[PDB]
């Protein structure tokens, strides 16, 4: 699954999940979108589970767009160690997501399919989500 091919630094401070999305809040490619309703770190394994969920549903046809990327390394100390002795090892990669982010989009598919595919994908995600459709408002952005 998804992870940066290379990076300047191995490990990152944790930071914060304050505020609405910086950007990425309007439909930009497909006809329908799955938008994040709550702040979270989305794991690469979640993204892929959401991805595979849609393509399994569409079965053949349609196109999925993934608008989030896991570039944030995740750290965990080896189990049953004590505090101290430095920062834990990189165990995976996550995407920071805030309320209003359009995470996925689909196109080339019927409304019924897009609603259904995006619903299941949401069930693979650790946050509440919303299915949306392309608007004058989006195109106007």
């Amino acid at each position: 699954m998804l992870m940066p091919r290379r990076m300047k630094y191995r490990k990152q401070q944790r930071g914060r999940l304050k505020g609405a999305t910086k950007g990425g809040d309007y439909v930009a490619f497909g006809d329908y979108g799955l938008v994040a309703l709550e702040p979270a770190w989305i794991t690469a394994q979640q993204i892929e589970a959401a991805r595979v969920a849609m393509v399994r549903h569409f079965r053949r046809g349609g196109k999925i767009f993934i608008r989030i990327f896991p570039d944030k390394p995740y750290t965990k100390k080896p189990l049953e160690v004590r505090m101290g002795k430095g920062k834990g090892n990189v165990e995976g990669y996550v995407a920071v997501v805030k309320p209003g982010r359009v995470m996925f989009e689909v196109a080339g598919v019927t409304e019924e399919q897009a609603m259904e595919a995006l619903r299941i994908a949401g069930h693979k995600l650790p946050i509440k989500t919303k299915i949306v459709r392309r608007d004058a408002y989006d195109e106007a952005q």
Binding site: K8, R60, G62, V109
Partner: protein, 98 residues
Amino acid sequence: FVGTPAGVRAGGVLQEIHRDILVKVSPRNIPEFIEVDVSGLEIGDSLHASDLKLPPGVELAVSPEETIAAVVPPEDVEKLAEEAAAEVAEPEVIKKGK
């Protein structure tokens, strides 16, 4: 986008890069559409703003290189197994210092 693309019949999906186009024009002259013949597009093919036939009195305000449509391959479950067994080379950290 007028026409049903040949690519779509062969299993593809028409990705509409621009759903509108930027143009210089007079208010007395505001068009409702610009038709585009997409029926010629196969899977892997694209249209640009150069293939846009402009109605009279309407002037392109973007580069003719600006691409406006494409017919792309569809999603395929048959591809999923390959995706899962795809092994990744671990991320490279760019060398700092000496």
